[PDB]
Amino acid sequence: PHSHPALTPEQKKELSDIAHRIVAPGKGILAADESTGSIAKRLQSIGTENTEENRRFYRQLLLTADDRVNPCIGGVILFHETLYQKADDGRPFPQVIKSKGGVVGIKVDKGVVPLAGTNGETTTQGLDGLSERCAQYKKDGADFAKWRCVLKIGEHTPSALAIMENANVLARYASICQQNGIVPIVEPEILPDGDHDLKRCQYVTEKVLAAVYKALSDHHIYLEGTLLKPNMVTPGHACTQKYSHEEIAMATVTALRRTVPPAVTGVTFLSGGQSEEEASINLNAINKCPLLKPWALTFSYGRALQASALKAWGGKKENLKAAQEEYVKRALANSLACQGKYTPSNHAY
Amino acid sequence: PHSHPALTPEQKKELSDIAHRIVAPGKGILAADESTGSIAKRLQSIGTENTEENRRFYRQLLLTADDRVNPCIGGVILFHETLYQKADDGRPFPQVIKSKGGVVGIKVDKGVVPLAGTNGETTTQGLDGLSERCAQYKKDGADFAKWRCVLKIGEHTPSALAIMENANVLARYASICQQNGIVPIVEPEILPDGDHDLKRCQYVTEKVLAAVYKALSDHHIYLEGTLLKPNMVTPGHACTQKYSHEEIAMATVTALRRTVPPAVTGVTFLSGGQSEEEASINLNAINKCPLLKPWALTFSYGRALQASALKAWGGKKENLKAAQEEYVKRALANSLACQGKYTPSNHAY
Amino acid sequence: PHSHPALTPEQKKELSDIAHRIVAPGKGILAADESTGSIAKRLQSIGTENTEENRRFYRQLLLTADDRVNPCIGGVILFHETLYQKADDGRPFPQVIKSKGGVVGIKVDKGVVPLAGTNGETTTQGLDGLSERCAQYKKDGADFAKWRCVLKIGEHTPSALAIMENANVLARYASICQQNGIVPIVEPEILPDGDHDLKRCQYVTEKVLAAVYKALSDHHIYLEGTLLKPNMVTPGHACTQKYSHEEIAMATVTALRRTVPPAVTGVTFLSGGQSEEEASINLNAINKCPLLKPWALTFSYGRALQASALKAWGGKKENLKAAQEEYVKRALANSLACQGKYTPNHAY
């Protein structure tokens, strides 16, 4: 094969430097990039009207929490609307984030679409005009991006088509980001839905991540200028067999060691529906796993950072500080967890 | 693998019936889907201002040419703008086309974009929201679509990445079309640029089309409900070796026989920069090639149907009939050519 | 990609000419390449000892049937042992075959082996030293070869690995054959075992054959110098739903039309465990199917040509003529069937 380099040394340095800042020791990501339809559910859960101002205020509440979160938060993923909103003091939210030591991220996918001829499987759209969007987002303060693909474990899923196509579109997204100075977070989420056990999740995760990294290679992606946002390896939500956090950690770290090249700068786990505590305990067990882990293992959490804060807020401005305190408590917990410092046989894998 | 049928028998019948109508014996396609920027080059060549009204009048001139074209024209590919324009008598252009026995087609890609890490290679964008666009276009009178991928022959091209990715995006586009009752024309154009010879073009065409049909299989595409729009197999533009039309025909038909399943309903060749006469003579020779050809071999021509008509028009309303006459003459010529009736060893392939 | 031609025009002409001779109109293939272990079961079924001489005599019985078979038999696939055996008159069996207008073929695979990490799936071995073996078989009178891959329909099979790997090894085998003047018959057999229905067999057959032809493209195989030996598309053995021969034919031809490039010179169906009559009726229906079929559709039959002959023989020399007559009858039947002359769609 013949090299026509995708990136200059200067471009590589920029991307690697950004990626490393996001996942520096003790740091993880606040995933605050819920679309309006997704944040509508959460505001509904606290009897709060889904208005642009309430969304602004709620995002403000998280982003302006006090300086205790600064060493915990290496990056914040925003939804488009929020990237262009301002705090009460008039500061653009990206400036707020940066002033606290955080890197600003932007979700750029345009959601899932059905794959015809599959058993309810999807790919993800959003490539059209993405290069121009990335150039604009970079000018407007974002240095990394997020794109979510979704796979499901079932009798006939994930299919060969779903694995190949989601890996391929992730690679296209990553390529476009890197041409524009944006670090792509590659998110091939395997949902926990179903009654499958831990070893089945581990098996599917291994196959998916092998496909992801082959596609990234085929598309000439610079891995040092990327992050990976995978599911932890867990039993299915409905699995009747029970597992310890140490078993979840061993399956997760084993799957990653078998598939993720050491050049990848970091792994920022999604927590899906895990409780706030569950997500911290699992991340902590992952970091205590006694296998060699050549990448940062940290968090990219939404509900696992926000659930208690949202409830404490309750849509009432006078609950601001109480709500922020709940978020700080989870930021501190997960900052400890991504160092193996949180307290509330590998051949079998 | 497990079947979760992409299409019902009723959906398949609709797509197969449309595809067969377009390429019925003696019929081919007027490719009139030049974007505003693309048609600008045309109108500039005749000192005509690139306004919507001038574009409307020119498209009208072609679409309302007299009834002699009806048995020649099985389909017309339109650009979005034109699908929603009307002739002077108030008739929507899709109604004009249908009243003359033509199927209405719509170009749906959003142009090429660069593949990072390649020697100037591209893929094509346009999948975002494509399902909704197809449903709307179907409602508004279109029954087939076009999507153009572009590959180039050079020292290191087409690369494995470019072949793989362009084949994959063609398959996604085809899948989405078929879910919405739209027959996709799959266009993997290999440009004739360069100094390569006929056998190099044949080799690359064979490899590209094998990749295209494997991707269509992987994505569960119903081939009977598709058409193929390939390059003919020709020497490169800068090649100094001379070849006969019979050699071009043999290389073209051999390449297609080696790659295109008989289930594909028809092949509608692009002619690129070929002269009007060259494109007709080549197509005629292709149809006279003594090898077995289990698909229709016809035309999807732009300049090869329009060049003399555009010149005779000159932007002047009073040249209407003179311009229409030149177009009619080429429609008649190519209708004969796609039957092997136009007049102005295989182991070596 | 860059062309470094696998084959010269002269090499291509040789392979295309051989391939076309084998499947010329009215002609099919006698598949007589059973391993000794497979033919043992057969000789036992007629109380005949599985000796070298009894195998020789049985193969002689088929190969020296009278000249009525000549327009029926375009090729005969032999097992190694038989390629080097002689008829009673001293003629090598390849000379016997050629003297009757047949092309001689040689089975070259060395059987299936298990794919670790699968649910009982296999690939096929036999590439080692294959080039030198082909060169020798060519000198010894063979002009085509056969290699059998085996796939199974089940809840999780055929797996992506099994499809990928069997397609790849077929392509390697085909490539080596073509370098040595041998036409490869590519046999990706999907077993009929199981209770799946006709559309499931059609779906799997379509996916397998697409993978096969992509692998053949990747390995620079000259399709005009090949033949395909697939399963017909049928319900599984244990399927309770019943289908007509016209439905089997439509599914089979549709699957082939969706995957087999017109450049492939011919399709020579295996019949497996189908009765002699069933195999003829199905092949006839395939050829009467009213879709366009740009390749020869004929037979590569073993038991469907041999079953009644084996019975009439019974291991007894005095039944030679009676046994040969049964074989001739099936050769004639299948010669008619591969022309659509034998008498005893959007839903696809």
Add this chain to the structure above:
Amino acid sequence: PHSHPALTPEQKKELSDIAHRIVAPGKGILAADESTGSIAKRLQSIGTENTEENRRFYRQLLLTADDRVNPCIGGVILFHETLYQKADDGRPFPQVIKSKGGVVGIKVDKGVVPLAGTNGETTTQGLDGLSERCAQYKKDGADFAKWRCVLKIGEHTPSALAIMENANVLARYASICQQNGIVPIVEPEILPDGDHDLKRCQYVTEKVLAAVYKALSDHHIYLEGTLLKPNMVTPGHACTQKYSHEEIAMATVTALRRTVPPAVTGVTFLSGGQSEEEASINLNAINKCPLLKPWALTFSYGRALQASALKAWGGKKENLKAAQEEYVKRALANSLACQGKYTPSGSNHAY
């Protein structure tokens, strides 16, 4: 996809334990598996007749070198013939190797064959009957195997076909070995021939290794029970641009970090035509490279361990001790090199 496990936990433990023993800190591999035709060239260069006894004597000279080599040699790759030969005292050579702390390996490929339709590219044969051969070799004392694929950098090579096919056959070989308790060393050698530069070798090495590990995944290979034997990343032999050992090290380690999952137990470099000292200096620089390296980085050397010993021997029995001393000296040097402790005394964004 559905798991029908290729290996039990016990089988995995056996393979992982073997793999780790071979590449334990300070240890590398003596690659002594030259076929009869290949060793003929070596013996002629010292005017010695290529007889079975001379081959036995030469292999004995290496395998019975004194105990200084024991902490240096974690594994020895043998050719079939040698696996069944005995030392002068009657001990089978596998017992000799084991008694000195080494794991016994067996080369199981049957050589390269040409890929039709390529510019002189090859794949490698040897799968036929390989399972039975592996079971027999395991019984007869071998615990790991070697299989060599060869790729070339040129105008149109390595081609997509060559990359795909060599990766696939390596995966088949690895699968069969692991079913029989044999650790497969996966060797996708990219030859150094040609005038390409360092960044071109790095690029091709990255693409080849990504294909290798995708194939191993597709074939359900247990990476912890494997080793990798790649080329170092170097300029081509005819390249006119000069590079430092630190640049070679950086390019090599970067390429591996970008493709080799951390689960792989170790990387045992081939040295090709590098001189004895060059192969040690480069391996040492690789181990001093200031990037994170989550696998052992050690040697699987033939000529780089044998060249001076072969010369000092000269086919003369009376030169035995002198010849063994030269081998010991290279074993000691490379044991230091694979720890980054070798001395002659005894920007990464640019990649």
